[PDB]
Amino acid sequence: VYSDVLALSMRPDGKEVAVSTLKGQISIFNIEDAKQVGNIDCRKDIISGRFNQDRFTAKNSERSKFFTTIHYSFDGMAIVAGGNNNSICLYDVPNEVLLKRFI
Amino acid sequence: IKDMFSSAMEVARFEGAQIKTVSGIRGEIKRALSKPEGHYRAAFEDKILMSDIVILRSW
Amino acid sequence: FEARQRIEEKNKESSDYHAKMAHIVNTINTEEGAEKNKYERERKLR
Amino acid sequence: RYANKRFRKAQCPIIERLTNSLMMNGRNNGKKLKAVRIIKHTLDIINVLTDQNPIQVVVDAITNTGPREDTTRVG
Amino acid sequence: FDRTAKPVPVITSEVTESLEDMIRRRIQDSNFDDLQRRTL
Amino acid sequence: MLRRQARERREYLYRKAQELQDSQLQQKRQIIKQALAQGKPLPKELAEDESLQKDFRYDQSLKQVDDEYAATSGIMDPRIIVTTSRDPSTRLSQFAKEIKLLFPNAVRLNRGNYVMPNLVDACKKSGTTDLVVLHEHRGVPTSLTISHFPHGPTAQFSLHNVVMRHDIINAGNQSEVNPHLIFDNFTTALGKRVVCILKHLFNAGPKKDSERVITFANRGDFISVRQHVYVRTREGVEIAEVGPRFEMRLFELRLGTLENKDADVEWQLRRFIRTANKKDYL
Amino acid sequence: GLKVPKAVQKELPFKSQIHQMKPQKKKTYMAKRAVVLGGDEKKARSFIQKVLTISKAKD
Amino acid sequence: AVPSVQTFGKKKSATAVAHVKAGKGLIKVNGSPITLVEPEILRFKVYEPLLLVGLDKFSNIDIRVRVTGGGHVSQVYAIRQAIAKGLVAYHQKYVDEQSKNELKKAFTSYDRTLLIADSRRPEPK
RNA sequence: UGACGGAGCCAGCGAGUCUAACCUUGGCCGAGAGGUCUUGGUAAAAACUCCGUCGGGGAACGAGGAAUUCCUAGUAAGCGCAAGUCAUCAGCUUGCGUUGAUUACGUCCCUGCCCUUUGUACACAC
Numbered sequence A: 001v002y003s004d005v006l007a008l009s010m011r012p013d014g015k016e017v018a019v020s021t022l023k024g025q026i027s028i029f030n031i032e033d034a035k036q037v038g039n040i041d042c043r044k045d046i047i048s049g050r051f052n053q054d055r056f057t058a059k060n061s062e063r064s065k066f067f068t069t070i071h072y073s074f075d076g077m078a079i080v081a082g083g084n085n086n087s088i089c090l091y092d093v094p095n096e097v098l099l100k101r102f103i
Numbered sequence B: 001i002k003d004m005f006s007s008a009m010e011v012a013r014f015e016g017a018q019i020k021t022v023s024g025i026r027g028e029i030k031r032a033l034s035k036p037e038g039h040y041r042a043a044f045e046d047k048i049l050m051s052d053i054v055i056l057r058s059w
Numbered sequence C: 001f002e003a004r005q006r007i008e009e010k011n012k013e014s015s016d017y018h019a020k021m022a023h024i025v026n027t028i029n030t031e032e033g034a035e036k037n038k039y040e041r042e043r044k045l046r
Numbered sequence D: 001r002y003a004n005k006r007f008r009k010a011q012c013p014i015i016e017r018l019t020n021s022l023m024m025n026g027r028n029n030g031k032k033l034k035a036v037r038i039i040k041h042t043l044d045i046i047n048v049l050t051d052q053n054p055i056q057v058v059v060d061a062i063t064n065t066g067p068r069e070d071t072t073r074v075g
Numbered sequence E: 001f002d003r004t005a006k007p008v009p010v011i012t013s014e015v016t017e018s019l020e021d022m023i024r025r026r027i028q029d030s031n032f033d034d035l036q037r038r039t040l
Numbered sequence F: 001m002l003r004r005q006a007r008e009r010r011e012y013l014y015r016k017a018q019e020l021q022d023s024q025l026q027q028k029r030q031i032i033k034q035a036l037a038q039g040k041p042l043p044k045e046l047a048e049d050e051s052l053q054k055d056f057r058y059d060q061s062l063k064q065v066d067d068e069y070a071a072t073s074g075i076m077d078p079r080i081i082v083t084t085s086r087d088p089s090t091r092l093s094q095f096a097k098e099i100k101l102l103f104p105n106a107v108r109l110n111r112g113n114y115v116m117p118n119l120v121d122a123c124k125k126s127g128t129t130d131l132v133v134l135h136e137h138r139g140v141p142t143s144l145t146i147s148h149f150p151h152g153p154t155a156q157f158s159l160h161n162v163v164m165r166h167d168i169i170n171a172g173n174q175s176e177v178n179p180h181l182i183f184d185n186f187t188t189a190l191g192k193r194v195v196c197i198l199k200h201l202f203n204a205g206p207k208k209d210s211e212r213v214i215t216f217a218n219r220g221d222f223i224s225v226r227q228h229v230y231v232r233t234r235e236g237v238e239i240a241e242v243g244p245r246f247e248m249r250l251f252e253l254r255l256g257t258l259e260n261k262d263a264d265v266e267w268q269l270r271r272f273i274r275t276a277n278k279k280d281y282l
Numbered sequence G: 001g002l003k004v005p006k007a008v009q010k011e012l013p014f015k016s017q018i019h020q021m022k023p024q025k026k027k028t029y030m031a032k033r034a035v036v037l038g039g040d041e042k043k044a045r046s047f048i049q050k051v052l053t054i055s056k057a058k059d
Numbered sequence H: 001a002v003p004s005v006q007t008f009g010k011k012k013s014a015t016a017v018a019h020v021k022a023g024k025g026l027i028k029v030n031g032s033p034i035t036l037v038e039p040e041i042l043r044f045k046v047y048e049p050l051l052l053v054g055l056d057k058f059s060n061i062d063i064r065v066r067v068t069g070g071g072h073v074s075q076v077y078a079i080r081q082a083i084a085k086g087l088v089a090y091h092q093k094y095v096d097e098q099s100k101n102e103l104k105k106a107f108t109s110y111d112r113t114l115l116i117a118d119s120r121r122p123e124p125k
Numbered sequence I: 001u002g003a004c005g006g007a008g009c010c011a012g013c014g015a016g017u018c019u020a021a022c023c024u025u026g027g028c029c030g031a032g033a034g035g036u037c038u039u040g041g042u043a044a045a046a047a048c049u050c051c052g053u054c055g056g057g058g059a060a061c062g063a064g065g066a067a068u069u070c071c072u073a074g075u076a077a078g079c080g081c082a083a084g085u086c087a088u089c090a091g092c093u094u095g096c097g098u099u100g101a102u103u104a105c106g107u108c109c110c111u112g113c114c115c116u117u118u119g120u121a122c123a124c125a126c
Helices: B008-014 C002-045 D014-023 D032-049 D054-065 E013-029 F002-037 F044-048 F051-055 F090-102 F116-126 F189-201 G006-011 G029-033 G040-058 H043-053 H072-093 H097-110
Strands: A005-010 A016-021 A025-030 A035-041 A067-072 A078-083 A088-092 A097-101 B017-021 B026-032 B040-044 F080-084 F106-109 F130-137 F140-147 F154-159 F180-184 F212-219 F222-232 F237-254 F265-268 H004-011 H014-022 H026-029 H061-069
Touching: A016 A067, A035 H097, B008 B026, D014 D032, D014 D054, D032 D054, D032 H072, E013 F180, E013 F212, E013 F222, E013 F237, F002 F044, F002 F051, F080 F090, F090 F106, F090 F130, F090 F140, F090 F237, F116 F130, F140 F189, F180 F189, F189 F212, F189 F237, H004 H072, H014 H072, H043 H072, H043 H097, H061 H072, H072 H097
Parallel strands: A005 A067, F080 F106, F080 F130, F180 F212, H026 H061
Antiparallel strands: A005 A016, A016 A025, A025 A035, A067 A078, A078 A088, A088 A097, B017 B026, B026 B040, F130 F140, F140 F154, F154 F237, F212 F222, F222 F237, F237 F265, H004 H014, H014 H061
8 A cells, every 4th residue: 555554444345455554644454365446535534633732724634534433233234433633524435435434 | 826736636635724815814725627638626715816926835 | 545644644743753852841841841940049049 | 376276277268278288298397488389379260260259269179079977097 | 935824624534533423422411502492 | 563573672672772882881880889898998089070970879770581582581481484495496495394393383384486575574573583594505504594583683604414204214293382491501602692582482381291301502612402302211311412413603693683694793703813712613 | 086876876865965067068158268378378377386295295 | 836747668778758748649769750760560569559549638728749769669668668658657746546447447458558668687597 | 488699788796915726857056955947748707698500429328217305485496706714524515696486375175283171351332
C-alpha cells in the first residue's frame, strides 16, 4: 500500500480486507488473488478541527486527516469509519461513496 | 614469479616455502603452474611491485 | 613431511635456548648480587 | 505473480501460459522475446489459413485436448 | 631452508583411533557440552 | 526498522566502550571490598579518594556466556539458513544438503541471483538467527563462513579434509535427532569465543538419552569435527562414525555481519608474521 | 590525492559532502572580454611570481 | 511559473525519471518520440497508459521521460510505470480530483503494477 | 533447437606514482659495462531485436544406457563483463548484472525420522 496501513477491518465474507491508511484512504483488497478491487478516498471529507493552542490552519493541519478505525456492516455493503478527528463517516462500498458524515 | 625456477618438479619441491622480496616484505610460495612450465604463485604481504626482485635464501 | 619435521625441531631448539639463557642470567643475578649486597652492607657498616 | 498461491497460475491469462510453456525447452530457457515472436507469427498463420479467429481456435484446441480420466499405478 | 606454515595434518589409523578413544572415554564418563534450558 | 537496528547497534557499541573504560573501577572496588572484609590499610590513591570512597554504597550493592547471544541464549531456537556460494556445482550442492541435514533447525537455500545485502535483509526481516555460506573449489569444499544476523559475529573458517557421505557409501540415512555435543581443548579466550559461536549455532538441552553426538576437537590449531552414533553396552561403549569428517581452521572473526567487509575485526590469522609457526592459535 | 566511489559520494550526508567543481568548457563572455596588460606589467607579474616562490622556499 | 510535476519508476535496477508539464501535447522518451522505443514486441507495453486512458488527457500536456539502468524488458516496464504515475500525479496536483480518482481506478482495474512496483523481497523457509 | 554480412540498443560491481611478455637478423656508438636502431617468429558486454543471404567430419563420434544424485520463484537453465582481499583459488575462485519458465504449495498410503501415549492449565465446552 502507498502509506502505512494503520487500521484494518475484514469482511464477513472473509474474502476482502478493508484497510485504512495515513494518506486518508480506505482500500478494499480481494484475498484470493491479492489485488486492490475497490478504493475510497476520504481525506477530503473529514471535518477536522483546530485546537485552541495551535499555530496553523485546520485546513493545512495534518494531524487529523486519516481514518484510524474501520468496520464493515454485515451485508458486506457499508463501512463505518472514524478517526482522531471530529467526525464519523459511513461509506457505501459498491459505489464507493459517502452516505453521511456525522459530527 | 617467473624465473626462480624452470620446472614444475622443482617448484613442487620448494613450494609452501618462505620468501622475502628485496623490498623487505615477506610471503610464501604456494603452488606451481601449468601452461608456463616453471612459474609459480606466491601470496605476499602487500601489493608487490613489478619493479622488485624476489629472493629465496638457501644453504 | 619435511615441513612438519623441520618446524617441530626448530620450535624445540629455540625454546630450549631461551630456557638455558634465563637459567644462566638468573643464576648470575641471584648468586653475585646477593654477595654484592652482602659486601655493601659491609661497607656501609664501617 | 502467478506462482505463489495455489491457483494464481489459473488466474493468469491463457496466451501467457502457452507462450511460457513454449519457451520451456533445452536451449530456449530464457528467451521470452523469442517465444512471443514465435506465437505471434503462429497466430498470424492461424488467421490466414483458418479464417475465423486465432484466440477462439486456441481455446477450442485446449478444451478439446484436455484429458478427462487418467489412471495411477496401484500400490 | 625454512618455511612459513605447518602443513595440514593427514588423517591415519593413529589419529582416528586416538580421537575415537578420547570420545569413547568421554562417553563412559558422560562429560558433555551442551546448551541447557534457562528455565523460569 | 533499519532505523531501529542502527540505533540498537549504536547503543551497544557505546555500552561496550564504557565497560572497557570502567573495568579499572571494577578492579578498584574489588580492592576496597577486599580490604573492608579483611581489614588492611588502603593504598595512597584509594585512600585519598573521596568521590568513590563516598559513593561506595550503591556500588557495594553492585556485583558465564558471551555477550551478543546472552539476550536469547536459551529461549528461542536458533534457526539457520545454509546457503550455497553461487552457481553451485553438484558436489557442492550435495555438501550443502548434507550440512543442512547435520544441523537441526536448519533450512537450505540455493543461491542464484541473491546478493548478500538482499539476503542479509530478508534474513534480518524474517528472523533467521544464523547464516552459513559455503565456498568450493572444483566440487571440493574449502570455505565455510558462519554469520549471526542480529548484528553479530562472522567466523570465516577454512575446511580441508572433507569426506562426503554419499561419496562414502549407500549408508542409508542419518538420525537427525537433536544431537549431543563434545568440545575438546578449546583453552584461550579465542577458543572460548569459537566454542560459544558453534554451541549457540546448535540447539539446546538434548534429551538425556539421545543417540548421536557431534564432536569438535582441537588438534594443533586445526579443529576436527565428527558425527557418531553410540549404543551403550554393559562392558563398554562402541560407536559408529557418521556424517562428514573434515578438518577446519578459523581464519577470521568479523564483529559485523558477513557482508560488511569493513567491520571491526577481533581476530585474524596472521601468517606472514615472523614468529607465525611457533605459537598456537595464530 | 584520494578519490571517492560513486555510491559514497552520492550518499554522503549533507554537511560532509565533497565539492568537485568541473572545468568550464564553453568559453564565457567575461573570460573572453577581460584584458591582460603587457610589457612592463608582463615582466612585473613574472617578477612577483619569482619573489613569492623564493620567499616561500626560504620560509 | 510552469505547472510541473515529476515522478519515478523502478524495475529490477532500472530508473525512469518522468517530468510532466503543461504544454503542447507530446510524449518523448529521452529525446526521441515514444513510437521509436526499440524492442517492438513491447512498444505497446509502453503505450498501455496512453491507450487505456485515451488521448486528450495527454493532448493537454507534455511528458518527457529519461531512462537508465536495467536492460530491455526492465526499462520498458519502468517507462510504463513512470508514465502512469506521472499522469495521475499531475491530474491530482493541477486538475480535478475526480479525474484523479477515476484514473487510479481504471489503472487498478487493469493491472496494479503500473502504480506500485513490487519490491519482490526474498523469502525464508 | 542453425550459419554468415551489415544494422539496431540497455547493465552493475570494482580506480595503491601502481597493470604487466620472451626468443631473432644485423647497423651505429661505446675502453668497457653497455646504449640506441634495426630486426624475424612464438606467449594473452553478451544473448536479444528489425533487414540480407545459403539451404556429417580427418580412427572416431549424430544430445550420451542401467543405476544413483540435486531442485519449489527472481528459484531451473541460459549469457558476458570484473575483481584475486593474511586461510583456499589460476587446470581456476568469488562477486555484479541482464533474460526468466514448467509443475506440487498437497498428503502420512510406501520410505524413513520424531513424538507422545497421565489434561493438571483455571473456566465453558469433548
